[PDB]
Amino acid sequence: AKTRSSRAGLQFPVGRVHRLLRKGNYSERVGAGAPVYLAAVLEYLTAEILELAGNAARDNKKTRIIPRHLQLAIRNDEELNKLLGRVTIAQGGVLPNIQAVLLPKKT
Amino acid sequence: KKRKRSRKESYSIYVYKVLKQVHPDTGISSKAMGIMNSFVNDIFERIAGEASRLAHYNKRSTITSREIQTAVRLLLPGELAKHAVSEGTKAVTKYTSAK
Amino acid sequence: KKRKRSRKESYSIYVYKVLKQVHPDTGISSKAMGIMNSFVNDIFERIAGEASRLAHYNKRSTITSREIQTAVRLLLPGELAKHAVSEGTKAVTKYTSAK
Amino acid sequence: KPHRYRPGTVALREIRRYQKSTELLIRKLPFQRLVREIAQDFKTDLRFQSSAVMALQEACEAYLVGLFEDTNLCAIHAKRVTIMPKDIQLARRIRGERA
Amino acid sequence: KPHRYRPGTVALREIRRYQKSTELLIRKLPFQRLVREIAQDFKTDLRFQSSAVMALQEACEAYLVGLFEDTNLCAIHAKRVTIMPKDIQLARRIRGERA
Amino acid sequence: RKVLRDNIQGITKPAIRRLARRGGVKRISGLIYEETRGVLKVFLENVIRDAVTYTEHAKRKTVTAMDVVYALKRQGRTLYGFGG
Amino acid sequence: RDNIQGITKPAIRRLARRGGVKRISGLIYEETRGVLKVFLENVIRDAVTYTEHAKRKTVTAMDVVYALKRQGRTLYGFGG
DNA sequence: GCTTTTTTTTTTCACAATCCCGGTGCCGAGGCCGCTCAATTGGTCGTAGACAGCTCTAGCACCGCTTAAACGCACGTACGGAATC
Ligand SMILES: [Ca+2]
Ligand SMILES: [Ca+2]
Ligand SMILES: [Ca+2]
Ligand SMILES: [K+]
C-alpha cells in the first residue's frame, strides 16, 4: 500500500487534493489525473516562492524565512507579482521605493 | 487532560519538505508558514474554480487533468505557467506508469 | 427536412412577462432582450456562488433560502438589498402558505 | 549655532525607515476601539477575536499605504511634491472606489 | 464669407454628438483584420464567428472610451485640457493595468 | 456592557503621517489628515459590515478572523496570513 | 501585416470624444494603439485558450465573453 | 572689453543619525512520539463521454459598385510650459 504522491514523485498530498476537489463542489466527477496535476502545480509554485523568499532571507543574514522575505521575493519578481496582484501579505511591508523627483539634486 | 484540540489541517509539513529540497539550511517563521498556507489555499480555489467553469462551459461532468491544465494556462503568467504545465505533466506521466 | 438548432434556454419569456406587468404597451429589441438575459444569468451566478461559499464556509451541505438571503445582503447595495430581501421573504412566505 | 536639517531631509529619512520595516503604524488600541465603534453600528454587543482585529489592521494599513502611493503619483502628476485631498480623490476615482 | 469655428468648438460639438450615440466608432474590417492578425500569434488557421468579432469590438471600444474618461481627468488634474501619453500611463498605473 | 466613544480621532496625525511615509510621500497638506480618516472610516465600515454579516449568518456573537478574511476577499482585498 | 495602423487617427479621436476629451496630443494616437493592442492580446489569448480546450478551430462569441469575464470586463448582450 | 556684485560650484570641518559587531536571554521552531481518522486497497456497477458517421450551418473568398470617410496639406489660435514672483 503506497501513497499516490510517491507514485507521482511528489511531496504535496495527491490524496488530500483529490478529496478537496470532490468535496469543494467544483464538479460531480473528478478525474484521477486532476489531483496529481493540481498537487504538482501547487508544489511547483510553493517551491518557486520558497527559493526566492529563502534567498532574500539569506540576504538578510537570517536563517528563517519571515513574511518580509516572502513579500520581497514576490514583489521583486515580475510574474509572482502579477499572480499575487491583489494579495496582501500580512507583516510584509513594501519595497523600498522613493519617487525620483522627491530626492534632492545629487551633485 | 480536558479535551484535546480539534484537528486543523494545513499544508505546513509539505511546505517544510519542499523548503528543505530548495534551501536545506533555511527554515521558516510561524507567520510565514501561515502565509504559505493562504497562498496554497488561494491557488487551489483559483485553479479548481477555473477548471470547474471549463468543465461546465463544455457540458462536462468531470474535471480531468485537462481542465486543471487549461486552467493553469489561463491563470499563470508565462514562465510560471510553463514550468507548472511541465511539472504537472511530468507527475501524471510518472503516476500513470507506476499504476 | 431541417431541424438542427440545439435548443438553448433563455429567461426571455419571463423578461417579457415581467415586462407586460410594468409597462404592458412597450416591447423590447432582440439585443436588449439578450442584455437582460446576461443580466439575470450574471446575478444568478453571483448570488449562487456566495451562497455556495456561505455554506461551504459554515460546513453545510445545503444552500437554503437563508443563504440566498445572506448572499443578497452581501451582493446588492442598500436599498435594492432591502427590497430584494423583502420580495424574497414575501415570495417564500406565500409559497409555504400555498403548498 | 544649533543644527537643523532642511525641510524634507528628515521626511526622506522617515520614508526610508518605514519602507524598510513591517511593523503596524497605527497604535493598536485606538484602532481596536475604532473597530468596535464601527462594529456597534451594525450589531450591538459583539466580540472580536484579537486575530480578527489584527487582520483588520493589517488590511487597513495596507489599503491606506497603497492609496498614498497612488496619491503621491497624482501629486507628482500635477507637478507637486505635496499630496492633497484632491490627489486622494483622483486615486479613488480612478481606482473605482467612489464615483 | 470666410466662416471658421475657433479651436475646440467642433471638438465640443463632437463630444456632445458621440456621447449621445451608441454606434461603434472603429471601422469594422480594419478591426476585424487586427483581431485576426493578433489571433495568428496564438493559434494558426483560426476562424471567427462574426458575433465574436463584434463582442471583441464592443469590449475594446468600451475599454478605450472609459480609459479616455480617466485620462481626461488626469489631464485636468495637471491643469491641462489636452490629454497626453503620461495621463494614460497614470490612468493605467492607478488602475493596475501595469506597474 | 458599554457603548463606545468618538475614537476615529485616535487615528492620529503622527500615524497618518507614518503611513504616508511608507507610501513614499515627502510633503503633506494640512487637509490630508482629516480626509484620510474619512477614507479609513469608510473602508472599515465596508469590511466590518461584510464580516459581521458572515458572523450573523453563522449565528455567532463573536467576529472571527475568518469573517474578516472572507469579507476582505469579497471586497477584492485578499489577505494572506490569517487563515483560509 | 501591420493592421494596427487600421486603428486610424479619426477612429481614435472619436472614441476619446465619447470619453469627454477635448484636445489630444499627437503622441497619443500611437500610445492608444499600444494599449489597445495589449488589451486585445490578453482577451484573445484567453478566448482562444477556451477555443483550444473545446477542441475547435473557430472562435465563438462565448469564448470571447468567457475571457472578458475572467479579465473582469464582463460583457452583456452576447450570451452571458 | 571692464567691473563689480550676486551666483555656483567647490573645500574645510562639526554633528547626528545610521550601521554593525559581540553579548545576553528568551521562546518558538523543530522534531520526536503516540494515537486517530482519513487515505488506500481491492472489490463491483453504471454511465460519461470518446468515437465515427452524417447534416447543413455559417464561415470564407471574391466582385463591383457607390459613397462616406480617410488623408494630406494650408493656416493660425489658443494652449503648454518655462520664468519670475
Ligand atoms: Ca537551491
Ligand atoms: Ca449519452
Ligand atoms: Ca497657462
Ligand atoms: K459552421
From Swiss-Prot, chains B, C:
* A GO MF label: DNA binding
Q: Does the keyword Aminoacyl-tRNA synthetase apply?
A: no
PTM N6-acetyllysine: list the residues. 59
Residues the record lists as N6-glutaryllysine modifications: 8, 17, 20, 82, 90, 94
Q: Tell me the residues on which N6-crotonyllysine occurs.
A: 8
Q: Which residues are glycosylated?
A: 86
Q: Which residues carry this modification: N6-methylated lysine?
A: 90
Residues with PTM N6-malonyllysine: 90
Q: What is this protein called?
A: Histone H2B type 1-J
- Which residues of the entire protein appear here: the answer is 28 to 126 of 126
Curated annotation (Swiss-Prot), chains D, E:
Mod. after translation: Acetylation is generally linked to gene activation. Acetylation at Lys-86 (H3K122ac) by EP300/p300 plays a central role in chromatin structure: localizes at the surface of the histone octamer and stimulates transcription, possibly by promoting nucleosome instability.
Sites bearing N6-succinyllysine, chain numbering = 20, 43, 86
Q: Which residues carry this modification: N6-(beta-hydroxybutyryl)lysine?
A: 20, 43, 86
Q: Which residues carry this modification: N6-crotonyllysine?
A: 20
UniProt GO MF annotations? cadherin binding; DNA binding; protein heterodimerization activity; structural constituent of chromatin
Q: Which residues carry this modification: N6,N6,N6-trimethyllysine?
A: 20, 43
PTM Phosphoserine: list the residues. 21, 50
Q: Where in the cell is it found?
A: Nucleus; Chromosome
Name the protein family.
Answer: Belongs to the histone H3 family.
Q: What is this protein called?
A: Histone H3.1
What organism is the protein native to? Answer: Homo sapiens
Q: What is the lineage of its organism?
A: Eukaryota, Metazoa, Chordata, Craniata, Vertebrata
- Placed within the complete protein, the shown segment runs 38 to 136 of 136
Curated annotation (Swiss-Prot), chain F:
Compartments, record wording: Nucleus; Chromosome
Q: Which residues carry this modification: N6-propionyllysine?
A: 13, 26, 59, 61, 73
Q: What is the effect of changing residue 73 to Q?
A: In TEBIVANED1; results in severe early developmental defects when expressed in zebrafish embryos; results in defective cell cycle progression when expressed in zebrafish embryos
N6-lactoyllysine: residues carrying this PTM: 13, 59, 73
Q: What is the effect of changing residue 14 to A?
A: In TEBIVANED1
Q: Please list the GO biological process terms of this entry.
A: chromatin organization; negative regulation of megakaryocyte differentiation; nucleosome assembly; protein localization to CENP-A containing chromatin; telomere organization
- As stated in the Swiss-Prot or TrEMBL entry, residues carrying the post-translational modification N6,N6,N6-trimethyllysine are 2
Q: N6-acetyllysine (modified residue): where?
A: 13, 73
Residue positions where N6-butyryllysine is found in the record: 13, 26, 59, 61, 73
Outcome reported for the amino acid change (mutating residue 57 to R): In TEBIVANED4; results in severe early developmental defects when expressed in zebrafish embryos
- Modified residue Phosphotyrosine is at which positions? 33, 70
Q: Could you tell me which residues carry N6-(beta-hydroxybutyryl)lysine?
A: 13, 59, 73
Could you list the residue ranges forming a coiled coil in this record? none
User: Where exactly is the Glycyl lysine isopeptide (Lys-Gly) (interchain with G-Cter in UFM1) cross-link placed along the chain?
Assistant: 13
Task: Using the record's annotations, give every residue carrying the modification N6-methyllysine.
Answer: 2
Residues recorded with modification Phosphoserine: 29
Q: How is it modified after translation?
A: Acetylated as part of spermatogenesis progression prior to histone-to-protamine exchange. Demethylation is performed by JMJD6.
Kindly list the positions at which N6,N6-dimethyllysine occurs in this protein: 2
Its quaternary structure? The nucleosome is a histone octamer containing two molecules each of H2A, H2B, H3 and H4 assembled in one H3-H4 heterotetramer and two H2A-H2B heterodimers. The octamer wraps approximately 147 bp of DNA. Found in a co-chaperone complex with DNJC9, MCM2 and histone H3.3-H4 dimers. Within the complex, interacts with DNJC9 (via C-terminus); the interaction is direct. Interacts with NASP; NASP is a histone chaperone that stabilizes and maintains a soluble pool of Histone H3-H4 dimers.
Q: What is this protein called?
A: Histone H4
Origin organism of this chain?
A: Homo sapiens
Curated annotation (Swiss-Prot), chain G:
Positions bearing N6-propionyllysine: 9, 22, 55, 57, 69
Residue location of crosslink Glycyl lysine isopeptide (Lys-Gly) (interchain with G-Cter in UFM1):
9
Q: Where in the cell is it found?
A: Nucleus; Chromosome
Residues that the record marks as modified (Phosphotyrosine) are 29, 66
Q: What is the effect of changing residue 72 to R?
A: Found in a patient with a neurodevelopmental disorder; uncertain significance
Q: Where in the sequence is N6-lactoyllysine found? A: 9, 55, 69
Q: What is the effect of changing residue 13 to W?
A: In TEBIVANED3; results in early developmental defects when expressed in zebrafish embryos
* Key words, A-Z: Acetylation, Chromosomal rearrangement, Chromosome, Citrullination, Disease variant, DNA-binding, Hydroxylation, Intellectual disability, Isopeptide bond, Methylation, Nucleosome core, Nucleus, Phosphoprotein, Ubl conjugation
- Residue numbers of N6-succinyllysine PTMs: 9, 55, 57, 69
Recorded GO cellular component terms are: CENP-A containing nucleosome; chromosome, telomeric region; extracellular exosome; extracellular region; membrane; nucleoplasm; nucleosome; nucleus
Q: Describe the subunit structure.
A: The nucleosome is a histone octamer containing two molecules each of H2A, H2B, H3 and H4 assembled in one H3-H4 heterotetramer and two H2A-H2B heterodimers. The octamer wraps approximately 147 bp of DNA. Found in a co-chaperone complex with DNJC9, MCM2 and histone H3.3-H4 dimers. Within the complex, interacts with DNJC9 (via C-terminus); the interaction is direct. Interacts with NASP; NASP is a histone chaperone that stabilizes and maintains a soluble pool of Histone H3-H4 dimers.
Q: What is this protein called?
A: Histone H4
Lineage, broadest ranks: Eukaryota, Metazoa, Chordata, Craniata, Vertebrata
